[PDB]
Structure 1
Amino acid sequence: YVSLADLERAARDVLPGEIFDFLAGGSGTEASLVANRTALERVFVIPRMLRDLTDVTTEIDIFGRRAALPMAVAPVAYQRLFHPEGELAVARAARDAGVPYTICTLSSVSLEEIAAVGGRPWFQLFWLRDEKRSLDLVRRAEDAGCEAIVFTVDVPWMGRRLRDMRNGFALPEWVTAANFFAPATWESVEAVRAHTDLPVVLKGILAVEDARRAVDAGAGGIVVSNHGGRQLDGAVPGIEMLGEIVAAVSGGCEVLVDGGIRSGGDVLKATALGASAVLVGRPVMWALAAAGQDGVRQLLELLAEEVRDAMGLAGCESVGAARRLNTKLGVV
């Protein structure tokens, strides 16, 4: 595989159509799904030349741990839909690559099983029916050795995914929510913050004032995101809000971005716009579908080489240097 797009073609060949559509799809007309790509494609980097590249490193420190790349695997529910080893295949590959893996509340293998793989597991939270049960998922994750709580804040309920409606998609019998909902509010955030000493990271922030309030609320991070175009159809891409958000928080929490990251050059763009790191979703699932654990490993190796290549071509010996790159908007 020489690009992430080789993995999409391979996954489309193997997966049943309805499962590929569950993975690929967005809400509504898929305007936000398409815009994630449009927005990255319009961004051009202004590279620097003639800088020392003796010791180029793609490593970052985030939430108290070194990561090999400025990237983590996004939370994607129900990974046994894609391969029989599901979450465990992906988590093992992530661990071996040195990148954090986000364990989902709707994982198809229990969070404790996945955490036992090792590595840098984070845990993604959906707010449940009651405060007490939500907090017991958080405590389970903490007890299992997860390093951060990624509280998804863009899902008061799930968006309208028309592909899934048209296909009548449902989980096969052999895929379940192995860890076993209500709209979250700022009160819910405070309940979680008070319940754990782990960093709380709010995923699905797009308004500048929500980013500021996240810092004020004691978040350790945010993920600037439209949920891969799966929630509000017409929501702005995160990449379009990122520079404004980075300025507004002015170092008060880590600022991650996701949506449409499909290469190491896209990772460079995100960092040049101010991101601490990115999440990658769909491509990880394509690799899992195509070739299981070894597929995910190959994807992460490819991304690592693309990120190193882009950084050095742009004159950046470190991710911090990449954050200081300037950008220019173009057309098409």
Structure 2
Amino acid sequence: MSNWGDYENEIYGQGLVGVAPTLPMSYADWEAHAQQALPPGVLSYVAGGSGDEHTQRANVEAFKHWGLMPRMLMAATERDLSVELWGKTWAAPMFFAPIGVIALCAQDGHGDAASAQASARTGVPYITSTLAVSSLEDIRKHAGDTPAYFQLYYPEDRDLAESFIRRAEEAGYDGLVITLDTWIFGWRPRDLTISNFPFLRGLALTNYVTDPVFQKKFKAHSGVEAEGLRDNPRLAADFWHGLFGHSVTWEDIDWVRSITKMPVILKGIQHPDDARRAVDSGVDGIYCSNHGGRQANGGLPALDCLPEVVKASGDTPVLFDSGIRTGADVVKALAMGASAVGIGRPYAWGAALGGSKGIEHVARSLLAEADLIMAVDGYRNLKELTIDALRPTR
């Protein structure tokens, strides 16, 4: 280890012997190249957000209106970016946010296994979506020794919800993330224009196809056996659609907590009283997010919500995503009080240009830049990166 910023030294070292980089170095170049390297349906699905995309863009723009105050003569020559979350020490305050189509962002069709392997090699935890090409058991093996988390899309069948949760616990996941802001799909003009919706073609349904409860219920509905389902998952895509999206209730959350020992983390919280109610009810983690503006175009940047969610959450850890594009953004969200920050769009582009090694380069680039900003600007660890280190800017 010594420090995440050391990553730039190998890049410069290789140039001295005539070995040029092969992947881009900034989000802008990641996005521009990766968008052209993808099939058109995958590009539409990944780049696209809800409505006219103002929220998706405003999430990113929010980071331009905070500045870190540099502190001189601090000699922050060794940084400690580790964080302890629900009993596990993370090597970095950053994680791969769940992406249901990441498998298709890689040319080999296994971008989800690629992400888990990148997590094994880097120490950056992976959160698998419920939607995936590799089963959650295989993903957890690919993540090696790195803490791994399971994101539940709570289905409209409690036996299936319990089966997923049980499977995640047995597979060794370190926590359960329940996504609250996508139980129906928002208006997404780019996908609508070409009527693009991959899961209805039977893609990324492996966690259902491999589930005993889903197999039995689909067989009762259709007569189709588990082997036929595995050979053509699209046979069950309409059945999947019928049970995909339960609208979760507070009572559901109480029931989930009572059937698992995993810590439960609620994803999509923006209002501080929702954070307050959740923490007062025993929820282990708050994950402040608006799903990258992909599911509703209501206009409120996710970052605008983070300080009051942090206040309301007290000592309950708060995760943050929606709008992170560079290591500067990582540092700003951490200074606002997020315990760790999730990466979405950037690592989908990584997958498109280089599979597992591309994802890793994205993660190492983001952490290198965050660590170097902390070094230069005089913040030696995350405990010292407090909210009074920021200033609002024009």
TM-score range, shorter chain: over 0.9
Residue 180 of structure 2 aligns with an amino acid whose one-letter code is V
How many angstroms apart in 1 are the aligned matches of 2:260 and 2:301? 30
Q: Is the 8 A contact 1:200 1:219 kept in 2?
A: yes
Match of residue 155, structure 1, among 172, 182, 185: 182
Q: Is the 8 A contact 2:112 2:133 kept in 1?
A: yes
Q: Does 1:312 align with 2:337?
A: no
55-64 vs 20-29, which moves further: 55-64
Match of residue 220, structure 1, among 273, 276, 284: 284
257-266 vs 62-71, which moves further: 62-71
Q: Deviations over 1:85-108 (max 9, x none)?
A: 221001100121101100111112
Q: 1:213 to 1:242 in 2, by over 3 A?
A: same
How many angstroms apart in 2 are the aligned matches of 1:109 and 1:308? 33
Match of residue 294, structure 2, among 230, 238, 243: 230
Aligned to 1:63: 86
Q: 1:33 to 1:49 in 2, by over 3 A?
A: same
Q: Does 1:287 align with 2:319?
A: no
Match of residue 254, structure 1, among 296, 308, 317: 317
Match of residue 142, structure 1, among 149, 169, 176: 169
| Deviation for aligned residue 1:127 | 1.0
Equivalent residue pairs, number: 330
- 1:81-120 matches, within 5 Å, as 81-83=104-106, 84-117=109-142, 118=144, 119-120=146-147
Q: Does 1:184 align with 2:259?
A: no
| Deviation for aligned residue 1:179 | 0.3
| Deviation for aligned residue 1:48 | 2.1
How many angstroms apart in 1 are the aligned matches of 2:266 and 2:159? 20
| Deviation for aligned residue 1:174 | 7.5
Match of residue 41, structure 2, among 18, 24, 33: 18
Stretches of structure 2 lacking an aligned partner (at least 5 in a row) = 1-23, 209-243
| Deviation for aligned residue 1:324 | 4.8
Which of these two proteins has the greater Rg computed from alpha carbons?
2
Stretches of structure 1 lacking an aligned partner (at least 5 in a row) = none
Residue 185 of structure 2 aligns with an amino acid whose one-letter code is M
Q: Secondary structure at the match of 1:179?
A: helix
How many angstroms apart in 2 are the aligned matches of 1:174 and 1:85? 15
Q: Deviations over 1:15-66 (max 9, x none)?
A: 0222112001111111210110111111111222222313212221112222
How many angstroms apart in 1 are the aligned matches of 2:72 and 2:385? 13
How many angstroms apart in 1 are the aligned matches of 2:386 and 2:205? 38
Q: Secondary structure at the match of 1:278?
A: strand
Q: Does 1:201 align with 2:224?
A: no
Residue 169 of structure 1 aligns with an amino acid whose one-letter code is N
Residue 348 of structure 2 aligns with an amino acid whose one-letter code is M
- 1:315-326 matches, within 5 Å, as 315-326=378-389
Q: Does 1:51 align with 2:114?
A: no
How many angstroms apart in 2 are the aligned matches of 1:156 and 1:294? 33
How many angstroms apart in 2 are the aligned matches of 1:219 and 1:48? 36
How many angstroms apart in 1 are the aligned matches of 2:51 and 2:202? 28
204-213 vs 75-84, which moves further: 75-84
| Deviation for aligned residue 1:235 | 4.4
Q: Is the 8 A contact 1:201 1:221 kept in 2?
A: yes
Aligned to 1:124: 151
How many angstroms apart in 1 are the aligned matches of 2:330 and 2:358? 20
Q: TM-score, normalised by structure 2?
A: 0.81
Q: Secondary structure at the match of 2:128?
A: strand
Q: Is the 8 A contact 2:65 2:393 kept in 1?
A: yes
Q: Deviations over 1:212-235 (max 9, x none)?
A: 011012111111111100122114
Q: Is the 8 A contact 2:335 2:390 kept in 1?
A: yes
Q: Is the 8 A contact 1:58 1:307 kept in 2?
A: no
| Deviation for aligned residue 1:82 | 0.9
Q: Is the 8 A contact 2:100 2:204 kept in 1?
A: no
How many angstroms apart in 2 are the aligned matches of 1:308 and 1:324? 17
Higher helix share goes to which structure? 2
Q: TM-score, normalised by structure 1?
A: 0.95
How many angstroms apart in 2 are the aligned matches of 1:28 and 1:134? 30
Aligned to 1:133: 160
Residue 350 of structure 2 aligns with an amino acid whose one-letter code is A
| Deviation for aligned residue 1:4 | 2.4
Match of residue 175, structure 1, among 183, 197, 203: 203
Q: 1:123 to 1:231 in 2, by over 3 A?
A: same
Q: Is the 8 A contact 1:75 1:103 kept in 2?
A: yes
Aligned to 2:54: 31
How many angstroms apart in 2 are the aligned matches of 1:290 and 1:203? 29
